[PDB]
Nucleic acid binder design. Structure first.
Ligand SMILES: [Mg+2]
Length: 134
DNA sequence: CGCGAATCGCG
DNA sequence: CGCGAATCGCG
């Protein structure tokens, strides 16, 4: 399996798990940052990876782009394909924002179609995903 | 730590 | 029992 350079890659920057969550999507070839979500005060890394893929799908759909999305999160990929984020994070006032975003991203998936292939980034073969926060 | 995938205990 | 609830492998 080979890298598709004409693609978008996403990843999450965490400060703890659970902890602060941010994410971004970048051009796999050029590294150009295409979208970014500012820090969400608490979430899980998995929830962040899920939001990052869905944000990518919405971004690419708006632009009518047929580029695939790479994610290094097998869990988030499954959640998007299932249209269901199977997170165990407690729902309270502290976690209200991350859950609002996850709920909305699920709602988007259940009310839209998309052509974007969602591919697993193979870190062990290809090194770090381009959206890595380092 | 959170996930998906892969031994227990109660009815 | 045997099925549904309750450690492994990884990132
Ligand atoms: Mg990540």
């Amino acid at each position: 399996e080979e890298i598709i350079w004409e693609s978008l890659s996403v990843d999450v920057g965490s400060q703890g798990n659970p902890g602060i969550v941010e994410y971004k999507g970048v051009d796999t070839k050029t590294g150009e940052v295409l979208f970014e979500r500012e820090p969400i005060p608490i979430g899980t890394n998995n929830m962040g990876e899920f939001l990052a893929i869905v944000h990518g799908l919405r971004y690419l759909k708006e632009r009518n782009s047929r580029k695939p999305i790479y994610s290094n999160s097998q869990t988030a990929i499954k959640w998007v394909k299932d249209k269901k984020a199977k997170s165990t994070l407690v729902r309270n006032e502290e976690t209200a924002l991350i859950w609002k975003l996850v709920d909305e991203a699920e709602e988007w998936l259940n009310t839209h179609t998309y052509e974007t292939p969602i591919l697993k980034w193979q870190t062990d073969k290809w090194g770090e995903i381009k959206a890595d926060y380092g």
